[PDB]
Amino acid sequence: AQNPNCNIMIFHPTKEEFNDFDKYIAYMESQGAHRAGLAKIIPPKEWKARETYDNISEILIATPLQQVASGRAGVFTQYHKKKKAMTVGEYRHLANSKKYQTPPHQNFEDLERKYWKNRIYNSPIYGADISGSLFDENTKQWNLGHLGTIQDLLEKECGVVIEGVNTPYLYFGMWKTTFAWHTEDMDLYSINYLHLGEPKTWYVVPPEHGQRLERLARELFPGSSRGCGAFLRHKVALISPTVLKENGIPFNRITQEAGEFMVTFPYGYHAGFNHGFNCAEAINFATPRWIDYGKMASQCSCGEARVTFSMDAFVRILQPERYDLWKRGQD
Template sequence: MTVKSFRQKTNTSKAPTDEATAELEYWASVGDSKPLYGADVDASLLHKDSESFNLRNLGTILDLEEKTILGVTTPYLYFGTWLSTFPWHVEDKNLYSINFLHQGEAKFWYGVSAGFGKRFEQVVSKLLPDQHENCAAFLRHKSTVIAPEILEARGIPVVRACQRQGEFVITFSGGYHSGFNFGPNITEAINFASRAWIPRGIRAHE
């Protein structure tokens, strides 16, 4: 599907301007709405030779990887719509990620720090025992949507962030995150690593 046809198939509705109201409307719609989300598009809107800013050349140790891994060592584009969702997950191999909102409506994020990662997994496994029984690593399937209030009631702190056009969001190694879009937007994301990530990367590989 081309970007043009995607936009033709999606509505142009937007979230309420008030963030709290937008959150309430989003969670009220979960399970009923079926918004389209153009995710994991292998492309970039940044010039490949740009020196001032280029997601493909962040200068981290992940640049030493000679093999091309789509969405990990190369950026992905994401075309959002109102109510489109990215479920709870951590990045592949517990890498860091950087997300830039090129244009359009805001993207709303929820985050759980790596320090509460194990507790998060335990709580979610108890909340969704059937999924856990079928696959112990079911959170890697990126299909789990749980309201932050449910997690907070079980002792897991959840941070919130509203990313707007021209802004970056960085997720740290091992940090669970999820969220939704306030309307039509285009974001670009890629993974990266630091020396501090190496022990987490080794554990993720084991």
């Protein structure tokens, strides 16, 4: 069995290997990369996502989100307070202001210590989940807006024909902006490209041990657990590496830098934070190996998780017994 310790693997494809996306995902799996829940892919030196970023300040963040925390430093939840619209130029200036800028630090490890110590005492503002793409249309390799769609995958593997679309999303981050512990909708894969700016630190639990994390989360957030049998679908709970280690939960960590891709694998729980002003692009995708995970994915029916249009068909086809209850939570 490849990668039995479930380490995060890092890949350096050649320009030739970068042509066929699906093939390279299958390659990484042949080497055991999925067992970690997360892999890093460093593009060949000849590749570029786009010519320059010199023109991105005009993008609009229609609903910036202020991430307010409650709890203790290692075990907290965050809620998103909506703020007035602002341009990327406005947001970058805010990120770099004395109130929000990254503090002096020695190295990534020092900065990680400062994040876990102090996160809860601040409320950073995140421009998340913005439909759009920063890949040049002429970039043919690993262009996240030109992937094969999840609908097409389900049609090819299962023969059924469904509505729905699959487009990328932009994320504008600043110091301490935080992504809570989650798997993807329908336990899909994700791919994330860091276009520019400061790094993103990731934490991940191997898919084979996801239920260990869920059991700890039920213990640590007991009112939330009573409210919903899949409350991590709400994407609000944070648990630190120190707390994970105290409770024996297997995990790994890695820091993504600008120019790098990360792939999350089906049912790979992940969480993390941004080091300073940055911009990422991400999208969900499927492969044939995902279908079994889609069929078994948990679902929130309490009403909190509210998701895209396109998840309807996935539930309806893969989880018909759950469909009626889940759709009530949508409506």
